[model samples]
Target: MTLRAAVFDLDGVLALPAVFGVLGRTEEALALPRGLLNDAFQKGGPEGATTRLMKGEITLSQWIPLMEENCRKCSETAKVCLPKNFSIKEIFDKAISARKINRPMLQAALMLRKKGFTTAILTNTWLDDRAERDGLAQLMCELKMHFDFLIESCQVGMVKPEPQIYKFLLDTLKASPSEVVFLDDIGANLKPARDLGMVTILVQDTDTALKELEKVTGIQLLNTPAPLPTSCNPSDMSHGYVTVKPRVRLHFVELGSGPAVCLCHGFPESWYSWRYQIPALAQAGYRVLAMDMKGYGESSAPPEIEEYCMEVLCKEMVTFLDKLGLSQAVFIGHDWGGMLVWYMALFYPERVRAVASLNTPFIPANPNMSPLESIKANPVFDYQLYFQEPGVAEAELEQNLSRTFKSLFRASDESVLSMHKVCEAGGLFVNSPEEPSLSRMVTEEEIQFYVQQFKKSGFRGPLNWYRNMERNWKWACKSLGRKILIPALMVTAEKDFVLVPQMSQHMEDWIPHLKRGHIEDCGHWTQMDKPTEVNQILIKWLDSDARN
Candidate 1:
């Protein structure tokens, strides 16, 4: 084929693999083996309802229920049956959010068009079920940004692997069979395109696949894969554990050689949580030591929850410094780790030169209440209750590490209230059996490292932090309402879910000297979501702290 036009599939080809991110990882979300849903759509029953739906034989409403009602009746159907409450509209709603355009592919298409090759999308997706008036009319405006035409299965009444769809695409282009180049995910579908004398490239990602598309079209298109520190590169940092309080140990990672700038990590995270800042601060001429904090990473996970108490944890931090031969240091933390630093500046002020906190703000211990009571009394922290026990959240979260890691961190500002509502209604961790995504916020290899680490350190040690809430509350009350007189920087995620932006609004009143900043489009994972900004903001502040 001498290609003059390019055609591409949509799902998996243009979109990310899962419909709802981690449906494959959750048993309740999906019943069939992985990729079954796609197979069902591609090869509908010989009885013809599915084919009819794709061919516009039936409306979405009529076909969806009937297909579920008589699913196994189709000899070629892959699933035994659809999961209960599996709504077709729900899938479309999720796909609308989950589906992202491969910008580099679009760039390639634009460049190809400029270089004079006609471009079109030949996806097996549909929207004809919408109201006859403006449904097609409304859906037509996506522009696909640059593609000249879109031929969907429901509109064309045929899907890929069928010879007619290829014929339709070729005819639409008004080009000869030898001139069309096709890109699709399934090889069987590509066979039809190949038979039609069209070229085909199986897409892995826009980077690798676009190179092949460039081969046939002779047009260059590339994805600017961001150079990110998804996790701490071991070569840039050295790890070790120090013998600390009560004949215990605290695991930490250190980078550079200078004044000590000790860091504390938050819940459900490790020393790796400070991944973006560790090297930046180190390069700025400060020795950065990111601790795993109690019950995390390679650190000792004592059998008793009391070992994780605030006063005990404060003592542990001082002991860690003592073992390392550092008398005083600038303390920085985020999330629950911030809570630790707050107390550290309160009781151990002699050991903390200055401090910075992300997402979490300083809270003086309440004279009238325990930490557990304060948390239990609020609907916002119902998830903490679920984590306070043994084997409950651990089993559910560890049941699917991929799903848990993906789920824990995907909250948007809008979803924060809803999650709190969910927590109040039942339990945040186990109340839902569905899942979501982690964007390229980090790569698979980096996330896989987190999953493997979590698998090694079961959630029990982590959850113990919540179990000792009462002790932590009582421990910090020694100094009551004393202010953090140290030079401090407070960074808040613009759209954090659990720790709302407003949560830090009152920090100015408590910290006499505070430098505040914001991370745009960030959720709870402030540093990971926008590392470049966080690093820039952090090192500038640390640099300023050095000057002072």
Candidate 2:
């Protein structure tokens, strides 16, 4: 038969069914009554006289006194006094309030109407209550021009599943039952409609109901209905874990196709900091990944500076390794990276197949050598003191972005030239302020890269690395107190300010397989300054005793 119209049942069909009961505060007032109302409703007889009253077959005058008697019985059962005459009217008023439309189902009905089919709402609702009647009127007002006809149970005196309601709709619409499809969320409601020779669709399971309705009716609703998009390549990066101290987002950048090697970078740097090293190592048949430690780069910056301490940082490393599905890897660190690797060796010896560091010496938590004290001893380290001043460093560095980069990378010549105006006026540096020494260390391209990244979220994250020194020492003292058992390499930048030969001279005491290398001409930026020498050492070590 040809289809002419679509019918939707309200109250668990086009709208959610009303759930009338006691309000939370009212329940507390009726605490002595406990499960009285529930027991009566479940009994399903004259005991459920309140339900009959709700259906308008009984008067409110009769129901109110009966409700008091039920409350008294509940109090006697619970053995506690309950409030008397607690407004059942208020509770029932709230229950009979308008049911919210199931937007998805309503949209489906609208779709049918859009395709040149008539739409009607047939709902079972009590007409006695002013509030319920008003609610229906408001719903009709909202959908004034959408539906061709509306039927209410109170007006017809016949509730759904009675067959008469379906018959009434079919006759009024001047359409045979088979030419009309009825949709309801309740199975019982659909039975009577189907019995009258109409197509029936069930809109249950709110999550997938609309789609299921479309399947039954062959009329797609709920807008576009497209499948969620998915990534084509599985290698696309995503965040891993978050911890208590710092809410760091651990990321794994997998490169090449061999065994895995977890790479860690130093201060003011990130996983992106290993850009040059990654390609070289991956090309050499190693899986290299550099991580952005918490507070540095993209990782979360926890409010507690203590979270960035080395011990906590080391725990994060272990957690990160666990998430990456790696039991152990060739551990590599540079600058502060070296410090982390050292701690990793001390705390988790079995997890590292091999370990390496560049330009950093292991110095455990020392109450004597405060970071500020270190800066005082060496005027060059005065910047650390500046960073410790909270807003001052971020403001100064972010304000003079180029100058900050030059200062950080030991671009003294550029520092002097660029800040000539400020320096000459006795502001910060003591150099000539004229010929900015062409940044002898970091190349222009490399400097630009750091500058752009630094500009993004600013240096707060990187500065957090330095701020946690005290907390790191405390955490380290408790967390790690052992020596390295893995093959270890410490590559020292001869001309660097942070690491001196004497600092790491006693490495043999802690590390059994420790080998040390010295880059004579290089400064702090050893890897970038002497890639040939650095790569040579790395390849030789990986090829010889370090390869797992």
Candidate 3:
């Protein structure tokens, strides 16, 4: 049959939501048995509060009381222990706050509309007082511009899995069933539409559903290419600027001539941190590109907090690869760089061949709260809190550039490794050594290079990264259960008190093909502390596991 129209369901099919998964996570966190909350919510079946809410028979405010009562009944009947402090409101808020755009699916829908196909949304949702109160109605308003037509159950007084609603959609679109393709998350909803002679797709996975749609529509949707790489000599060690985003430029030093590897440095540091590894990797027959991440060392530092988010940073890395005409590269990072490489591996796995980190581990996203919320609860993250206040930490660090470098770049023994204590007292440099003894790890000349970099850029751009934990956390929610599906290496420093070596213990659970490497008695400055070992570990991984 000829297809002229495409229909999508909103919650699961187009606008993906964390939904019950957040509640499940909360249950686990509370030490309650899994599925308790979800089971309670769904127990009433067709006549339940959720179904009634979807049909506009009840407001979200009414549904909440029903759900709470149902939860109480379940706990008592199942002999489950309920904590007195467990608030249903809190769990629901978390679920509603987490909504990730299904970019590929949305793009497909928009593409179909452009190709003269009728694109519409048929969703079972409540846009009543409760939905408006919770901000879901506003979210729907934002998405209305993308579709040719939108049908909400609450607005129409009809929910899915009913024959009449499907028939209504057909009559409204003025298309024969065979001329339309419907996509929905629920099999029961699809069966009714399919029974009416429409081409129906049950979307369990986004990629799988997109592939199926491509075959049916004969429209090219998934394999869009990255912008052409600007012509350049990959082995050139001279520093250059690339516009990764419009008006957002990143400074980088490129060297070597083999498989590509990108290096990212952490906070308060630059590409110079990888000075020791760049030559070694380049000499080992690798094309090494080391970047002075935005907000540090001659890079364009946008004066906005949202610009420094993980999503924006990772996108820049991929664009950098595109600008070089490279499809993929092995990413190796340290400190903040370490955290980003792991996310790059997860978020843009296709652009990343393999990943490695020094002094950083793959920290999972908290299902309940943002990283800043978790940090606020812990004293160890007091320094991060200090960075949140705009201009506070920047003034302190920028006041004495040399002293800042001196305090920040020391070995564990010579420095106040217990950052929490120092941070709690006055700030990170509260107990600044009046005359800090210099360490052999960083020479005066090397320290002077850092001072000059900070002297020029100031500390605002780098500290802005620390201020974006809340925004970064939302980006992370999109990849909640996903693992690093690339060959991975994690190198830990024993004396790195902040990101301790022990923090890497649980990494193998998430990165199945991970290979572990360790540097003994080293501080946070793993690259400078034992550059030779780090270089060997990286080369060995790239040669063996990464190459394979």
Candidate 4:
């Protein structure tokens, strides 16, 4: 084939395999035979109900009954009783929410287009107006920005494994069958394209498929010696920079739609810290906004130390809402972010609908003196005093990126608790006997992502956050006696020595409507340490108390 254009499938090819695994997992849970879901569609033959569904001949509601009936017959044939309350819509929506983009394949498609080959997505997804409107089917909408053309079965009125759709694609591209290359997860779908004399690659695995694509295109797709793609590899998340303040640009990734949930990350962490929660919250019917705080990831970092003050950050948060056209959002924070969100609730109460913090608690401000005076007198906060020196902490942390993050993000009780106990005389981690190992909470790939981000942005801006305690204390004094009137949640980790669980005990006194959750045997990185528990606590609160 001449390969003037490259086409890819959506569900299992361009996007990660979603419904396929979700359906199988559901079947396994119900003790039903595997492949029952696929059989429900395959048994109807060439002009089956599913074929009609894909061809837009019937509404999804009309097809659900047909699916239930077919699935019932399938179970009977296997001499098994089907569950009494089997549901198609519920499981299908779960599958839709499980969708994630296949980054390597998407990168290949973009590379192909750059190489002068037109790129297109040919998918067999059924059209559902309600699903699109409800944001359940939003993964498909994200693809519109990248692909030159998106050929859907329902829109074209012809499904794959049919010669007509292949011919239609060829006609639409104005190219010969031999001039196109097609990729699909299903061999049967690829067979029709193969029969048409077009090159077809079965994507059994993303890496292997890319290897095959390399063989056909003679262009490098993987393992190329190149600079990092961006300041940080966001994986498949939709990321961009937006001006939230004068000379301050924040890089944020927006996902799903519905009620707004804004996430703020702490020191030494970016928006990626909320990767596990972002999709889960979005799937649970919330518009998830995860932003890289100023001076982290791809966001702009100012050189001035005072720019990272609590007052500046509060102003930025309010202006950030205005820039995004959000009047109010449920603010969730962890680490320094937790402290910031607590201040947000106090400083800009109108911009916050509710507030949640992980590991950090609301401490009443002292009108008598600034926090720096107190910290300077305590031996425990001497590590923070070390960070007050502008160039010292940055030089130690940036000296070896891997050692810095591994020592900080460890789950073992030793590092997180004691690493911050340095006296004013020395650098951070100077007393460590050995380099601490990486924790289970974060993988090597994730650590590498964090390293790459800091490699570009450096630690000056982040360390500056710690350098503003006096300014933060003074700024927070304005809200000294004002109680948090909105709903609030505080999640504390048992093993987080720096911000111990006891710190959150009196939060109810400050936040009248406060709720609390505690994670046992977890470290400072509470969300990453135990994503499932954190998400459950978050969604339950968001769905029940926060909204009310």
RMSD to the native, candidate 2? Answer: 22.2
TM-scores, each model vs. reference: 0.57, 0.50, 0.56, 0.66
lDDT by residue for model 3 (209-306), tens: 98889888888867754212112222335887888888788888887777889899998898888887877786667888899998988788888887
| Leading candidate by TM-score | 4
Worst 10 residues of 1 by lDDT: 133-142
- Per-residue lDDT of 157-251 in model 2, one digit per residue for the tens? 56666777778888888998888878776688888787778887776665576665566557667574531111112134433344433346665
lDDT of 3 at 198: 94
Clashing pairs in 4: none
Per-residue C-alpha lDDT of model 4 across residues 172-196, encoded as one tens digit per residue: 8888888888998889999888787
lDDT of model 1 at position 34:
68
Misplaced by over 4 Å in model 3 are 1-237
Q: In model 2, where do residues sit more than 4 Å from their true spots? A: 1-246, 366-382, 410-443, 479-481
Poorest 10 consecutive residues by lDDT, candidate 3: 226-235
Candidates' C-alpha lDDT: 0.71, 0.65, 0.82, 0.81
What is the Cα-based TM-score of model 4? Answer: 0.66
Ranking by lDDT: 3, 4, 1, 2
Which regions in candidate 4 have their CA more than 4 angstroms from the true location?
1-126, 129-235, 376-379, 413-417, 433-436
Residue 67 miss distance in model 1 (angstroms): 87
Stretches > 4 Å off in candidate 1: 1-231, 411-418, 421-438
Model 4, total clashes: 0
